[PDB]
Design a protein around this ligand. Structure first.
Ligand SMILES: [Zn+2]
Ligand SMILES: [Zn+2]
Ligand SMILES: [Zn+2]
Ligand SMILES: [Zn+2]
Ligand SMILES: [Zn+2]
Ligand SMILES: [Zn+2]
Ligand SMILES: [Zn+2]
Length: 258
C-alpha cells in the first residue's frame, strides 16, 4: 500500500509525536470512553473485519485502567463481540462522555457522502455525527485509520488527496483531536494500547489472542475488506502477519517496562 505509507511518512515527519500525544490524551480521560467502530463494505454493506478487534483491545485496556467503556457499532459487530461481553452504547450523547475514540469507521467526505477505498458509495446509517458534535463541544477525540476515508483523517486531507488513489472523492473531512495512522487500523489501535502500557508500567496487551479474536468475529459474519469474503483475515492479510505484529508490540512493551 504505497499511498498510506507515504501519508504516514508525511504525517509522522511533521507530527513526530502523534502516537505519544494520542496516548497522553487517552490516559487522561478514562472516566467514560465511547468507542466507535464498524466499516460497511459495498456492495453488501456488511461490517468489515478490521476495526472491531482494535476497538476491543482498547476497551479491555480502558477497563484494566479503572475506566468505563462502551462500544457504538453496527448490528453484526455487536453480534460478533457478544462472546467478549462488551458494554454497548444505548442512544449515546457527546456530553455523556469523557473521550470518544474511533477505530476504522467511515468518515464523511467533502461530498457529504461516504466512500469505500474503491470509491463505492457506502449506503448505511452513519456513526459519523457524534464526532462532529464532540468536536464542537471540545470533547477529547481520537481517530485511528489506514486509508484516508475514515473518521479523523480530516486532519490530513491534503496528504490523502496527494497520495491516495481516489483521494479527492474518498478522503474524509471529519477531524479528530489526535490521529493514529497505520497500515492496518487494528495495529494502530494496538499501538495505542502498547504505548499506554509503557507509560503506565503494565503490559495491557498481555493476554491478547489475535488469532482467537479474528477467527471469532469472522465466524459471526464479519468479512474481510479486500476479498470481501468470510476468511479469518484482515485487510487481505493473513493471521500469521497480524500475530507477528501483536507479538512484536508485546515485546517492545516488556522491553520498556521491565
Ligand atoms: Zn507527500
Ligand atoms: Zn444525557
Ligand atoms: Zn482504484
Ligand atoms: Zn481504512
Ligand atoms: Zn483497514
Ligand atoms: Zn511520556
Ligand atoms: Zn479493510
Amino acid at each position: 500500500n504505497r499511498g498510506v505509507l507515504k501519508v504516514y511518512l508525511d504525517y509522522r515527519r511533521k507530527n513526530f509525536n502523534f502516537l505519544h500525544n494520542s496516548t497522553k490524551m487517552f490516559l487522561d480521560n478514562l472516566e467514560r470512553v465511547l468507542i466507535v467502530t464498524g466499516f460497511p463494505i459495498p456492495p453488501m454493506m456488511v461490517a468489515e473485519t478490521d476495526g472491531p478487534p482494535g476497538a476491543l483491545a482498547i476497551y479491555r485496556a480502558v477497563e484494566m485502567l479503572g475506566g468505563k467503556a462502551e462500544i457504538l457499532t453496527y448490528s453484526e459487530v455487536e453480534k460478533a463481540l457478544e462472546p467478549f461481553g462488551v458494554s454497548l452504547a444505548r442512544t449515546p450523547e457527546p456530553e455523556d462522555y469523557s473521550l470518544i475514540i474511533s477505530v476504522e469507521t467511515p468518515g464523511r467526505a467533502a461530498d457529504g457522502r461516504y466512500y469505500s477505498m474503491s470509491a463505492l458509495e457506502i449506503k448505511r446509517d452513519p456513526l459519523d455525527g457524534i464526532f462532529l458534535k464532540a468536536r464542537a463541544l471540545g470533547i477529547p477525540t481520537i481517530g485511528v485509520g489506514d486509508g484516508g476515508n475514515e473518521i479523523g483523517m480530516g486532519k490530513i486531507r491534503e496528504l490523502v488527496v496527494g497520495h491516495v488513489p481516489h483521494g479527492e472523492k474518498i478522503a474524509s473531512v471529519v477531524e479528530t483531536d489526535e490521529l493514529i495512522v497505520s497500515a492496518v487500523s487494528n495495529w494502530g489501535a494496538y499501538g495505542l494500547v502498547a504505548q499506554a502500557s509503557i507509560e503506565v508500567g503494565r503490559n495491557l496487551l498481555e493476554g491478547w489472542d489475535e488469532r482467537r479474536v479474528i477467527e471469532a468475529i469472522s465466524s459471526a459474519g464479519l468479512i474481510d475488506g479486500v476479498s470481501k469474503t468470510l476468511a479469518p483475515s484482515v485487510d487481505g492479510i493473513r493471521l500469521m502477519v497480524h500475530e507477528g505484529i501483536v507479538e512484536l508490540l508485546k515485546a517492545v512493551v516488556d522491553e520498556a517496562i521491565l
